[PDB]
From Swiss-Prot, chain A:
Post-translational modification: Autocatalytically cleaved at low pH; the two chains remain linked via two disulfide bonds.
Glycosylation sites: N62
Organism domain of life: Eukaryota
UniProt similarity note: Belongs to the repulsive guidance molecule (RGM) family.
Protein name according to UniProt: Repulsive guidance molecule A
Protein task: Member of the repulsive guidance molecule (RGM) family that performs several functions in the developing and adult nervous system. Regulates cephalic neural tube closure, inhibits neurite outgrowth and cortical neuron branching, and the formation of mature synapses. Binding to its receptor NEO1/neogenin induces activation of RHOA-ROCK1/Rho-kinase signaling pathway through UNC5B-ARHGEF12/LARG-PTK2/FAK1 cascade, leading to collapse of the neuronal growth cone and neurite outgrowth inhibition.
From-to range in the entire protein, with total length: 47 to 116 of 450
Quaternary data: Interacts with NEO1, BMP2 and BMP4.
Compartments it resides in: Cell membrane
Curated annotation (Swiss-Prot), chain C:
Highest taxon of source: Eukaryota
Illness: Brachydactyly A2: A form of brachydactyly. Brachydactyly defines a group of inherited malformations characterized by shortening of the digits due to abnormal development of the phalanges and/or the metacarpals. In brachydactyly type A2 shortening of the middle phalanges is confined to the index finger and the second toe, all other digits being more or less normal. Because of a rhomboid or triangular shape of the affected middle phalanx, the end of the second finger usually deviates radially. Short stature, facial dysmorphism, and skeletal anomalies with or without cardiac anomalies 1: An autosomal dominant disorder characterized by short stature, facial dysmorphism, skeletal anomalies, and variable cardiac defects. Distinctive facial features include midface retrusion, short upturned nose, long philtrum, high-arched or cleft palate, and variable degrees of micrognathia and dental crowding. Skeletal anomalies include patterning defects of the axial skeleton, characterized by 11 pairs of ribs and brachydactyly of the fifth ray.
Name of the gene encoding the protein in the UniProt record: BMP2
Tissue expression summary: Particularly abundant in lung, spleen and colon and in low but significant levels in heart, brain, placenta, liver, skeletal muscle, kidney, pancreas, prostate, ovary and small intestine.
Assembly and binders: Homodimer; disulfide-linked. Interacts with SOSTDC1. Interacts with GREM2, RGMA, RGMB and RGMC. Interacts with ASPN. Interacts with MAFP5. Interacts with FBN1 (via N-terminal domain) and FBN2. Interacts with type I receptor BMPR1A. Interacts with type II receptor BMPR2. Interacts with SCUBE3. Interacts with TNFAIP6 (primarily via Link domain); this interaction is inhibited by hyaluronan. Interacts with ERFE. Interacts with BMPR1A/ALK3; the interaction may induce HAMP expression.
Protein name: Bone morphogenetic protein 2
Amino acid sequence: PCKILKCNSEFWSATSGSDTPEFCAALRSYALCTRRTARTCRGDLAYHSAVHGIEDLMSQHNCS
Amino acid sequence: KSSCKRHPLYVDFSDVGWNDWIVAPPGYHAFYCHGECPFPLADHLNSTNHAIVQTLVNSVNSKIPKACCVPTELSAISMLYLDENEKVVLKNYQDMVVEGCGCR
Amino acid sequence: LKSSCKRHPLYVDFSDVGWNDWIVAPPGYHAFYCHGECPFPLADHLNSTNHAIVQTLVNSVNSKIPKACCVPTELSAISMLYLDENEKVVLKNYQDMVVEGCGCR
């Protein structure tokens, strides 16, 4: 019932692939995918690894 | 160079940021596997036929990497997180602790 | 920069490893092998254990803890021919001989 499996495989298409080449629009959309399945993933390990991982690629690539 | 064996590793959830969702425990002993997989490998109860073949092939052609030292026995742990309307939930998470290593 | 965890080809010639001294058939076989980086993300897609997730996460905070290792997670068996003391052809199925798939552990 936790949709990160969907979200993680969908981003593992865009990045990689084929920095910033051109965006960040793959990171913006994946963050939203997590942000939506947020309620169905309160006790999911990968979900929290995902949410924690996205954050790390956001600051390194300096998007927004 | 040191052989394939288990090593200690305590995971502090605050240090990895998972303290933002895990109520209990504050961390846990996960362990990790490290070390070389050399000839012979059979002295390891856990070493698959492929792990033997790959290692043997490696001794003839250096470009083919050795088998890898990874957990072959794992145990589960109970963890506490918060539910909607901040209720405590207990969940068992599998393959959390390395009980043993082996070449794969 | 550095290639991700995936299966690679590998044909094992039994004469090249000396196992031709006991294996009658086949002359070799396609074993394959796993190689590549296990970086964030890993569950189902790259296929990893909760530990492999935790180890990789820990690695991103403390570089001294190695990343999860790319290893076969699916293996198939092969039939092989050898000779017993009677010097008669015996057929044996050997399990975990072929990598069908990789993952992080």
